[PDB]
Design a protein around this ligand. Structure first.
Ligand SMILES: CC(=O)SCCNC(=O)CCNC(=O)[C@H](O)C(C)(C)COP(=O)(O)OP(=O)(O)OC[C@H]1O[C@@H](n2cnc3c(N)ncnc32)[C@H](O)[C@@H]1OP(=O)(O)O
Ligand SMILES: CC(=O)SCCNC(=O)CCNC(=O)[C@H](O)C(C)(C)COP(=O)(O)OP(=O)(O)OC[C@H]1O[C@@H](n2cnc3c(N)ncnc32)[C@H](O)[C@@H]1OP(=O)(O)O
Ligand SMILES: CC(C)(COP(=O)(O)OP(=O)(O)OC[C@H]1O[C@@H](n2cnc3c(N)ncnc32)[C@H](O)[C@@H]1OP(=O)(O)O)[C@@H](O)C(=O)NCCC(=O)NCCS
Ligand SMILES: CC(=O)N[C@@H]1[C@@H](O)[C@H](O)[C@@H](CO)O[C@H]1O
Ligand SMILES: CC(=O)N[C@@H]1[C@@H](O)[C@H](O)[C@@H](CO)O[C@H]1O
Ligand SMILES: C[N+](C)(C)C
Ligand SMILES: [Cl-]
Lengths: 316, 316
């Protein structure tokens, strides 16, 4: 058994799908997309039986700016770790994680997160990977709160228009909106979501996938939507093989803090869903939500679908 | 808005699917099988807008024997409750549950359970209905531990036979095993599982659905397996619309108490899966497991798929 760096994506993807493909169906396009485009200091360590890949760990350190935030080198990420089912309980997982953790720690990492990285596969430890919690617990990870992906079939329900509101308009983004959007993000969501917008446009996100809410002239909120014609396979549609032919998704979605708790998020959501529904979307996901916002999406018939536990190791 | 008893199973099935069908796809066949064959005192109370069903609750009292056990009339069950998405937060669920609970309480129920009834749809509050936990909390239900359905694609993996002490042999049940099977259940599982066996054989279960493990001529264990030829749609295959073609399932599985913790359950599980694999089964479910037993199945590449929270109200 040898531990060494690998960039054999096909072998990794095949191993992924054999072990967890029932609930996290991976394809090479997504896998390449997310690994190649990530801008953080990153590495894949494989475990090998001769030339046969029998495990891997993908890990990162926050070394690349997030919008207006400079990188915090103290934060590292385990993007994913899987040892093949036929080679479990032989110490392979331990060695892979030790290899990742040692390297991150030697480069100044003091806080180690299970998922939640840029270009993540997971926001935390998936519930379908619940048995892994004990493996991480024993290795110093503290198990925290949950995040959720929500699912709904927008073809199945009609919603009545939200209360009409003077001044506000919701519309898919046009090219001309680009400057107003970027100024809005700089003001209101100037970290990760600003960074995503910067980078997603560079790898073929299109304006048709952004919805904007304006008061008069000013962008006060946005949503990012996905359907089966979107070319960027973003987080809401990672697991689109589970979502049927007319799959879609939504996230992120945000309203300027000033404007919140007055029904404008609701208006944005409603019209964003109406847009997807007119694009003939059926089953669709709203990814990476907190418990106390579930009911906001629940109003529109969304239900928790996948749950992920937040898990963090502090290097003492 | 009227609260009254409802008979139209098709309207119930549609409301079910409209509201939660993405994650718990119902059909009339499944609905009828489970509601009609249930032997407890049972009722469906509907909430109506004129002629239109807008919500329902299905509820039961333990009034029918369970193998050699008398019913405990102190136990009641909320089988399911759904209010249509366009009629939430109008007090309808409250009204429906108030009626169900009042009727149960009046016929002697002191402990009200979420799910877990005979012919259940759910062992507890599904994670996909996490928001309803709060609804049940306010009514005095205590949120307790979790159960899990596990999923695996038995076509994707091969395992080495577990080592086999001489004398033990596993085989698919034959008609002449019936008496030996019933003697064994009477000895080791004389409550719920004996009762399921009694009833299921009356409503379409075939011997080909049962695997037996013997020590010599003695039955010492069984599993109930399911594929797309099973005429009884049991708990593992309720949500078969999510499992694809060549779906299957397994559960229950039991070994005589005097024979446990010697590797025999592992052997029975292994052969049961081999039989399903040879039947061309792909994705399959092992239903209603506790957290402590997940790794037993985990070694055969099963993963938690659905989670349900146990919830119990003590009548004051
Ligand atoms: C951010 C995320 O990736 S979340 C998702 C995590 N990944 C998954 O859930 C995918 C599915 N699961 C897996 O791939 C694996 O179970 C992993 C990666 C979690 C664990 O990998 P493994 O190779 O089994 O780990 P390893 O074998 O080192 O350790 C497991 C146990 O076996 C023990 N062990 C080590 N050598 C042996 C041996 N020769 N014989 C028996 N047991 C052994 C270890 O001590 C350990 O027990 P401990 O945790 O109580 O210390
Ligand atoms: C065993 C099982 O069945 S588990 C699965 C449970 N079912 C589901 O999850 C299906 C999806 N969800 C639903 O169907 C619904 O949300 C239900 C059944 C959980 C609740 O139905 P509702 O009709 O919205 O309940 P109802 O309106 O009485 O009460 C809900 C909330 O609205 C408010 N409310 C209560 N009464 C009223 C009223 N007269 N008018 C307006 N609002 C009210 C309260 O804020 C209440 O919150 P609380 O329950 O936390 O106190
Ligand atoms: C009650 O209202 P509802 O649940 O909306 O049911 P409907 O009034 O649509 O009737 C549905 C079925 O239940 C039947 N039904 C109505 N009241 C009933 C009762 N008290 N007992 C048994 N069946 C009943 C109807 O006759 C109908 O059956 P059918 O199609 O075989 O005639
Ligand atoms: C509902 C929502 O907005 N979820 C977003 C998600 O879409 C995005 O992928 C992630 C990372 O930026 O941040 C979450 O907050
Ligand atoms: C793994 C297992 O045995 N699960 C069984 C399940 O199959 C069965 O449906 C239920 C009710 O009888 O009892 C559970 O213990
Ligand atoms: C690097 N990150 C903070 C955006 C996850
Ligand atoms: Cl009835």
């Amino acid at each position: 058994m040898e531990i060494k760096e690998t960039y054999d994506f096909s072998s990794i993807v095949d191993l992924w799908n054999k072990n967890i493909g029932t609930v996290y169906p991976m394809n090479l396009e997504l896998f390449k997309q997310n690994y190649i485009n990530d801008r953080q200091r990153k590495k894949i360590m494989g475990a090998f039986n001769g030339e046969i890949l029998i495990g891997f760990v993908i890990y990162k350190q926050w070394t690349y700016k997030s919008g207006s935030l400079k990188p915090n080198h103290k934060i590292g990420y385990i993007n994913s770790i899987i040892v093949d089912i036929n080679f479990r309980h032989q110490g392979i997982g331990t060695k892979l994680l030790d290899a990742a953790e040692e390297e991150l720690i030697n480069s100044g990492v003091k806080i180690l997160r299970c998922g939640s990285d840029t270009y993540h596969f997971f926001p935390g430890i998936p519930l379908e990977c619940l048995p892994s919690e004990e493996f991480f617990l024993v290795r110093g990870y503290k198990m925290q709160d949950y995040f959720y992906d929500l699912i709904g079939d927008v073809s199945k329900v009609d919603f009545k228009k939200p209360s009409i509101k003077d001044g506000f308009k919701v519309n898919v983004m046009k090219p001309e909106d680009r400057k107003g959007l970027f100024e809005f993000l700089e003001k209101s969501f100037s970290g990760r979501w600003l960074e995503e917008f910067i980078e997603f446009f560079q790898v073929g996100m299109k304006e048709r996938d952004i919805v904007l809410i304006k008061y008069k002239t000013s962008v006060i909120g946005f949503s990012h939507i996905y359907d089966n014609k979107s070319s960027f396979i973003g987080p809401p549609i990672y697991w689109k093989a589970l979502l049927g032919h007319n799959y879609g998704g939504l996230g992120p979605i945000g309203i300027d803090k000033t404007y919140r708790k007055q029904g404008l998020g609701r208006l944005l959501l409603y019209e964003s869903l109406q847009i997807l529904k007119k694009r003939e979307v059926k089953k669709m996901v709203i990814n990476w939500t907190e418990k106390d916002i579930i009911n906001f999406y629940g109003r529109f018939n969304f239900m928790p679908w996948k749950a992920y536990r937040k898990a963090t190791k502090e290097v003492k």
